[PDB]
């Protein structure tokens, strides 16, 4: 029934930054050529769209935020070859347009038709498909998943398995894939290796799961908050070290207990000081350090080039280096084949009308992951 | 004849820093087990042993500096399986002891029995084999090649081809191998790629030669001194850009002319600002930047983590990532097979008694490479 035409539905609008979201009724335009319209089912809440709210990630306001979700396909636009109505799908905040030189590159994943670098808050055609009372509402990362319905370009949706639990596989649209790929795809962790993960929120928990999948024989999880050590442990850490317990610097204590430094170090906290501390404690002649993510507000960090000189690799990346459209079906199939559990990351499930409440949880942080259901 | 016993010969001594070298007569002790004694033939002059002289590279004084040389084997000590008297050889300032975890590691090359990290200026047994009038003279990087004779441990000498031109292949003991490996072994430059080398002294010229060997279709050489552009060009650069010609920042102009940033950027200057500028102008989603070398005095450099986040790799290394003992024979055989020329790097050849003069050349810098002959 909704197929040819505009749908009217509730969605979360930010009309102004540093304001809670308004649940509004909006008009979701029908999809033009190579667009898909998706009925959302479950969307996670993540720091990055809370950065929008604070003014920190600058994306044009008013906006429908949301980038991490799974749902079902309703309308498909003209020339849509990959999805067909009724398909389970996950919006891709970092696309896979297939044509550019990053998509062609055998390792690059930060697709040039992305709205992260220079955010205009639109669909590829420069327009928006949201209007709240005639006023237009901008799209976020060409996903906007805090809406009952949304329209994405065919390069920003991946089709997934029919039997897929969408209240659990929506994590594969951001946080789980960002950490499990920082371990499996970016650092390319090895059989036998010693990994150290810094920070153990949902992303640090996804790293440990990846490092576990590659066969690391040690995963040292380090967090200044003791309460984090259990789930981390559950998920794969062999040891957990609380920096505030030692009189020394932890890179000392970590090189010390690693016999000269760990193989792979990962920075899941996002701070400048720990990006440096995690660089300084993988082995000198061959360790790899991977910055899993860095806040859009970050300033410069002081580092002494000597550290790289020994023979270290410093690596950063977006979405665990996964080419989005290719990989997300393959991760879901893996979840489907009981390779990894998403369950200890999902700590809360709230109805979508309780989005502001999910934020409260994220902001005082004891909440690994809040999922919002439609 | 000299074989069982102490040789008395001239060598360059630093008795005190910031002093020119004294040509002295010294007593080179006979080699103990697993030591080799080498009659030098040609040794190059390089910034690193001039850093010693300035106080900057702290190594114990008095010392016989010199790390880059080729020569012939005179005495071998007890249990020496790799060289036999009369063998052409090159002292290895960074060893290949075969046993440690860096030597075992498939990429690591900064061997743990090295005297670079924590320099004690001795042979592996903690003693010295030099005495000038009863007073002991320390060894440099377990090589000390500014002496007519020297003793090295069997892990710090590689045997090379009999027909080898030792006045030309001594470059393979430091400067040529440090740049040609930063291109061929560390960055692993590719067929078709666009490389940018920053700084074009003898090392930057060795990079261009490596990038050329890997098949890069562009080698942009960039130096604020115009006079460098010719030899660079000769050696393989396709274009040379002089930063002072543009009103803009060169990473702009370089990303601009590279269509979004080069593949591989190399910093051969050693400055902090250009380590940053070369990081910032390889492609965002997949470029690799390699710091070829950094002065022992360097302080911290300000950098914004964002640069790594896109998907960049920052890599440093010692001796072009070559495992010393394995690789140097293979490079010489390549020179021998007319794969690369060492000739445009060798600009001066002076007799060894003119060491201080070779320094003068290096310090006012128009001299690509001064070789000293015995
Ligand atoms: N901007 C990004 O792209 C990005 C990616 Se990861 C990231 C940062 O990570 C967080 C999101 O990832 P996440 O799911 O892990 C939520 P999080 O906030 O729980 O992650 C940070 C973790 O580090 C811990 N921590 C704080 N300081 C220290 C310290 N000095 N040493 C060791 N542990 C410490 C926290 O207790 C926590 O578990 C964000 O809140 C932000 O701080 N930003
Ligand atoms: N400490 C190390 O391990 C190490 C490795 Se190479 C390195 C530095 O490199 C030099 C040794 O290597 P080399 O054989 O190339 C001798 P060099 O001094 O000739 O190398 C530096 C090159 O960079 C050029 N240069 C200076 N400033 C700029 C600039 N702002 N932008 C572009 N070009 C510029 C110089 O004209 C020169 O060709 C040392 O003198 C030192 O400065 N230190
Ligand atoms: Zn693309
Ligand atoms: Zn996210
Ligand atoms: Zn070794
Ligand atoms: Zn050198």
mmCIF file with all atom_site columns, N, CA and C in Angstrom, chain A residues 291 314-317, chain B residues 279 284 303-314:
data_model
loop_
_atom_site.group_PDB
_atom_site.id
_atom_site.type_symbol
_atom_site.label_atom_id
_atom_site.label_alt_id
_atom_site.label_comp_id
_atom_site.label_asym_id
_atom_site.label_entity_id
_atom_site.label_seq_id
_atom_site.pdbx_PDB_ins_code
_atom_site.Cartn_x
_atom_site.Cartn_y
_atom_site.Cartn_z
_atom_site.occupancy
_atom_site.B_iso_or_equiv
_atom_site.pdbx_formal_charge
_atom_site.auth_seq_id
_atom_site.auth_comp_id
_atom_site.auth_asym_id
_atom_site.auth_atom_id
_atom_site.pdbx_PDB_model_num
ATOM 1  N N  . UNK A 1 291 ? 44.148 2.825  16.314 1.00 0.00 ? 291 UNK A N  1
ATOM 2  C CA . UNK A 1 291 ? 43.246 3.796  16.870 1.00 0.00 ? 291 UNK A CA 1
ATOM 3  C C  . UNK A 1 291 ? 41.931 3.365  16.246 1.00 0.00 ? 291 UNK A C  1
ATOM 4  N N  . UNK A 1 314 ? 51.391 2.596  12.890 1.00 0.00 ? 314 UNK A N  1
ATOM 5  C CA . UNK A 1 314 ? 50.282 3.280  13.530 1.00 0.00 ? 314 UNK A CA 1
ATOM 6  C C  . UNK A 1 314 ? 49.292 3.277  12.401 1.00 0.00 ? 314 UNK A C  1
ATOM 7  N N  . UNK A 1 315 ? 48.101 2.812  12.766 1.00 0.00 ? 315 UNK A N  1
ATOM 8  C CA . UNK A 1 315 ? 46.998 2.606  11.852 1.00 0.00 ? 315 UNK A CA 1
ATOM 9  C C  . UNK A 1 315 ? 45.756 3.172  12.449 1.00 0.00 ? 315 UNK A C  1
ATOM 10 N N  . UNK A 1 316 ? 44.941 3.909  11.699 1.00 0.00 ? 316 UNK A N  1
ATOM 11 C CA . UNK A 1 316 ? 43.586 4.257  12.098 1.00 0.00 ? 316 UNK A CA 1
ATOM 12 C C  . UNK A 1 316 ? 42.648 3.670  11.013 1.00 0.00 ? 316 UNK A C  1
ATOM 13 N N  . UNK A 1 317 ? 41.310 3.716  11.189 1.00 0.00 ? 317 UNK A N  1
ATOM 14 C CA . UNK A 1 317 ? 40.280 3.394  10.175 1.00 0.00 ? 317 UNK A CA 1
ATOM 15 C C  . UNK A 1 317 ? 38.816 3.600  10.643 1.00 0.00 ? 317 UNK A C  1
ATOM 16 N N  . UNK B 2 279 ? 52.879 12.886 6.136  1.00 0.00 ? 279 UNK B N  1
ATOM 17 C CA . UNK B 2 279 ? 51.840 11.980 6.571  1.00 0.00 ? 279 UNK B CA 1
ATOM 18 C C  . UNK B 2 279 ? 50.605 12.521 5.891  1.00 0.00 ? 279 UNK B C  1
ATOM 19 N N  . UNK B 2 284 ? 43.988 9.505  1.944  1.00 0.00 ? 284 UNK B N  1
ATOM 20 C CA . UNK B 2 284 ? 43.339 9.454  3.240  1.00 0.00 ? 284 UNK B CA 1
ATOM 21 C C  . UNK B 2 284 ? 42.909 8.071  3.648  1.00 0.00 ? 284 UNK B C  1
ATOM 22 N N  . UNK B 2 303 ? 50.601 16.442 16.095 1.00 0.00 ? 303 UNK B N  1
ATOM 23 C CA . UNK B 2 303 ? 49.957 15.809 14.971 1.00 0.00 ? 303 UNK B CA 1
ATOM 24 C C  . UNK B 2 303 ? 48.467 15.643 15.337 1.00 0.00 ? 303 UNK B C  1
ATOM 25 N N  . UNK B 2 304 ? 47.527 15.647 14.401 1.00 0.00 ? 304 UNK B N  1
ATOM 26 C CA . UNK B 2 304 ? 46.151 15.470 14.834 1.00 0.00 ? 304 UNK B CA 1
ATOM 27 C C  . UNK B 2 304 ? 45.726 14.085 14.432 1.00 0.00 ? 304 UNK B C  1
ATOM 28 N N  . UNK B 2 305 ? 45.417 13.213 15.391 1.00 0.00 ? 305 UNK B N  1
ATOM 29 C CA . UNK B 2 305 ? 45.004 11.826 15.154 1.00 0.00 ? 305 UNK B CA 1
ATOM 30 C C  . UNK B 2 305 ? 44.068 11.552 13.976 1.00 0.00 ? 305 UNK B C  1
ATOM 31 N N  . UNK B 2 306 ? 43.270 12.561 13.576 1.00 0.00 ? 306 UNK B N  1
ATOM 32 C CA . UNK B 2 306 ? 42.344 12.465 12.467 1.00 0.00 ? 306 UNK B CA 1
ATOM 33 C C  . UNK B 2 306 ? 42.946 11.870 11.226 1.00 0.00 ? 306 UNK B C  1
ATOM 34 N N  . UNK B 2 307 ? 44.197 12.269 10.993 1.00 0.00 ? 307 UNK B N  1
ATOM 35 C CA . UNK B 2 307 ? 44.928 11.799 9.842  1.00 0.00 ? 307 UNK B CA 1
ATOM 36 C C  . UNK B 2 307 ? 45.039 10.273 9.755  1.00 0.00 ? 307 UNK B C  1
ATOM 37 N N  . UNK B 2 308 ? 45.201 9.613  10.888 1.00 0.00 ? 308 UNK B N  1
ATOM 38 C CA . UNK B 2 308 ? 45.284 8.167  10.853 1.00 0.00 ? 308 UNK B CA 1
ATOM 39 C C  . UNK B 2 308 ? 43.911 7.495  10.695 1.00 0.00 ? 308 UNK B C  1
ATOM 40 N N  . UNK B 2 309 ? 42.887 8.155  11.243 1.00 0.00 ? 309 UNK B N  1
ATOM 41 C CA . UNK B 2 309 ? 41.517 7.741  11.293 1.00 0.00 ? 309 UNK B CA 1
ATOM 42 C C  . UNK B 2 309 ? 40.897 7.450  9.970  1.00 0.00 ? 309 UNK B C  1
ATOM 43 N N  . UNK B 2 310 ? 41.214 8.242  8.963  1.00 0.00 ? 310 UNK B N  1
ATOM 44 C CA . UNK B 2 310 ? 40.743 8.059  7.577  1.00 0.00 ? 310 UNK B CA 1
ATOM 45 C C  . UNK B 2 310 ? 41.013 6.661  7.021  1.00 0.00 ? 310 UNK B C  1
ATOM 46 N N  . UNK B 2 311 ? 42.221 6.176  7.334  1.00 0.00 ? 311 UNK B N  1
ATOM 47 C CA . UNK B 2 311 ? 42.758 4.861  7.016  1.00 0.00 ? 311 UNK B CA 1
ATOM 48 C C  . UNK B 2 311 ? 44.238 4.873  6.631  1.00 0.00 ? 311 UNK B C  1
ATOM 49 N N  . UNK B 2 312 ? 45.068 5.813  7.091  1.00 0.00 ? 312 UNK B N  1
ATOM 50 C CA . UNK B 2 312 ? 46.524 5.874  6.841  1.00 0.00 ? 312 UNK B CA 1
ATOM 51 C C  . UNK B 2 312 ? 47.390 4.932  7.713  1.00 0.00 ? 312 UNK B C  1
ATOM 52 N N  . UNK B 2 313 ? 48.614 4.646  7.232  1.00 0.00 ? 313 UNK B N  1
ATOM 53 C CA . UNK B 2 313 ? 49.639 3.867  7.956  1.00 0.00 ? 313 UNK B CA 1
ATOM 54 C C  . UNK B 2 313 ? 50.845 4.764  8.135  1.00 0.00 ? 313 UNK B C  1
ATOM 55 N N  . UNK B 2 314 ? 51.379 4.821  9.347  1.00 0.00 ? 314 UNK B N  1
ATOM 56 C CA . UNK B 2 314 ? 52.589 5.578  9.612  1.00 0.00 ? 314 UNK B CA 1
ATOM 57 C C  . UNK B 2 314 ? 53.502 4.465  10.040 1.00 0.00 ? 314 UNK B C  1
#
